[PDB]
Structures are given as C-alpha cells and as structure tokens.
C-alpha cells in the first residue's frame, strides 16, 4: 500500500476513494469510526487517563485508527489507500482537494452547509448521524475561524524538535508530539481542524472525510520526524500512570502497543519520504 499526496491522485483514484468511503457510510461502518473518535476525545484528559489525544500515544493511536479505516476501505475496493493532505502546500480553498470531484468545497455562509461534492447533504449519501446537535448536514467554513493553515517553515520548526514527548505527557508538554498536535507553539494539527470548521472543529470530526487526509499527513510528519531524528524514539518507556508507555497496549484494540506502530513501513509506504 502506498499513501499518495491527494493533489496527485488520478481521476480514477479519486473516484474509487469516494465510492469506497460512501459504501462504508451506506453500510453503517463509517459512523462507528466517528463514534469511536468522539468517545476518546471526550474521555482523554490532561490529569487522567489519556490515549487518543493530548498524550504521547496521540500519534500511534491515530496511526492504528487510520489503519483500521484504510483496511475497511480496502474491504470495499482493495486498490484504495488513504491519501494525505499536505496543508502546508495546498493551503487555499482552490486546492483541487475541495473540488466537486473529490471532497467538495466550503459551506455556504448562512448555515455552513457544503453544497457540492459527493458528501453534500443534497446527494442523499452523507447523513450526519453521530452528532452533538440537531444539524444533519456536512458543514465547513474553510479559513473562517482561523485565517491561515500552518506554513512549511512552521512545520520545519516542529520537525526540528528532537525529543518525542516530555513529562507531563499532556497538552502542557514541550517536545515534538505536543507541538505537532498543536496545544503548544505555532500549532499544526489542532489549527487545521479549526481552519476547516464545521464538524472537523468538533469531537465528531471524522464526519468530514478530510479528517482522514489530515491525519494521514500528520502521520507522514511523524515518519519525517523519525528520519530527521534516528536517535530519538517514543517515550515514556515504562511505568507511567494514565499514559500509554512504549510496550503497553492501547484501547480500544487492547492487542497493539506503540512499539508495534513506530515503523509505518510494516503497513504502508509514502509516495515520497526523504531519507536521513
């Protein structure tokens, strides 16, 4: 499996990715990914148990969650892989990402409703079922709540941080994981959720298929960081309360550890990933 930059997909690849996502939605499988993510977002806390977010396991947890979703896509069409969105480069609403043949564009100004693309409510094919309010249509406000996506220079600043994570292993930490996640510093991952707006800014953010492409690029940046820092590795490495240590297993799967997920090449490669 090769994960490709969304900007490089062929028309056929776009078509098959959209169709596989819509079939997972139709069959009911998609919404359970939305529900899993919301459960963890609502339960991960800085002072208590934390696994999917605001903690060192944010990266391996989303790596495995994306692998579950990619496998489900492949169960519909084995040719499909998750593409990634390099938001440092494709930073405008005119990126082909947001074209009607791929994810559709921003929401109208009255109610944020996405009006085109395969996931527009008018298609009948994308009900928002796992939700925190009455609205049942996909919403976005690209660039509405924050003006700008992170820039390449900002990303480079984060990639240069040598320590994977640091005590207290939460949203106050210094180190790579939290700067990539975005609770400290120039803010990479959190700010992208805010920039898309709509459901992507909420605990039910996998309602928007861009979630997957965002996290596939966050996941690529982890791989890039590993190449810049071959001498740095996941921490903590044992006995830390409330935090997933290197060789501890992770919920919900219970059968996989951060250690099993550090090397993406066991599962997939990227179209391009610079060497050390």
């Amino acid at each position: 499996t090769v994960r490709k930059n969304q900007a490089t997909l062929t028309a056929d690849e776009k078509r098959r990715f959209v169709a596989a996502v819509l079939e997972l939605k139709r069959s009911g499988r998609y919404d359970e990914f939305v529900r899993t993510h919301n459960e963890f977002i609502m339960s991960d806390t800085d002072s208590g148990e934390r696994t999917g977010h605001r903690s060192p396991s944010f990266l391996p947890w989303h790596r495995r969650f994306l692998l579950d979703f990619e496998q489900a896509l492949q169960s519909v069409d084995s040719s499909v892989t998750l593409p990634y969105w390099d938001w440092s480069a494709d930073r405008t609403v005119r990126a082909s990402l947001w074209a009607p043949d791929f994810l559709g564009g921003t929401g109208r100004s009255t109610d944020g409703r996405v009006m085109d693309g395969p996931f527009a409510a008018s298609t009948g094919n994308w009900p928002i079922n796992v939700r925190v309010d009455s609205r049942t249509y996909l919403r976005r406000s690209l660039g509405g709540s924050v003006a700008e996506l992170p820039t390449r220079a900002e990303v480079e600043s984060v990639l240069a941080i040598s320590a994977y994570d640091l005590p207290p292993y939460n949203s106050a930490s210094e180190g790579f994981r939290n700067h990539l996640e975005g609770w400290r510093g120039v803010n990479l991952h959190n700010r992208v959720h805010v920039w898309v707006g709509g459901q992507m800014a909420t605990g039910v953010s996998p309602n928007d298929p861009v979630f997957w492409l965002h996290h596939a690029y966050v996941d690529k940046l982890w791989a890039e960081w590993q190449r810049r820092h071959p001498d740095s590795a996941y921490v903590p490495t044992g006995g830390t309360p409330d935090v997933v240590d290197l060789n501890e297993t992770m919920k919900p799967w219970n059968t996989v550890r951060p250690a099993d997920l550090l090397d993406h090449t066991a599962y997939y490669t990227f179209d391009a990933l610079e060497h050390h």
Partner: protein, 78 residues
C-alpha cells in the same frame, strides 16, 4: 478552585455554568438547559465538544463559542 458559576443570555440563548464515553469534568455548562460537554486543559483554558481543538480562556467563553458554532441549532444531550 473551579471557576465561578455564570448565567446569561448570549445571542438569544441561555448559557449557564457551574462547578460540579466522556470524562470527569468538575464543571458543567448548559445551552438552553442542555448540557454541553466541556473540558479544562492543563494551562487553565477550556474547550467544548463543539470546539474541541480550539482553547478559550474560560467556561463562559467555551459556552459562547458553542452558541456561535450552533447557529441556532438545538444541542443534543451527550
């Protein structure tokens, strides 16, 4: 200590806060009487389930951001 309670009408909706699948929380927020999941970050800022990647300084700020997000929509209980 937890933040002080609050009660006001913001953009036509009643928002309330009070010290007290989802977490602990020693603080509760409501929008027209429907509980809004909110969480406190280590640095003292707050988020809610409808703005969960966007820290704001206080629970009232999180309630107000939820009203702005909702654009009149009823909240669903969590």
């Amino acid at each position: 200590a937890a933040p002080e309670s609050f009660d006001e009408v913001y953009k036509g909706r009643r928002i309330q806060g009070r010290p007290a699948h989802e977490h602990g929380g020693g603080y509760e927020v409501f929008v027209d009487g429907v509980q809004l999941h909110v969480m406190r970050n280590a640095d003292g800022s707050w988020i809610s389930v409808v703005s969960h990647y966007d820290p704001v300084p206080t629970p009232r700020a999180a309630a107000r951001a939820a009203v702005d997000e909702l654009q009149g929509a009823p909240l669903l209980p969590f």
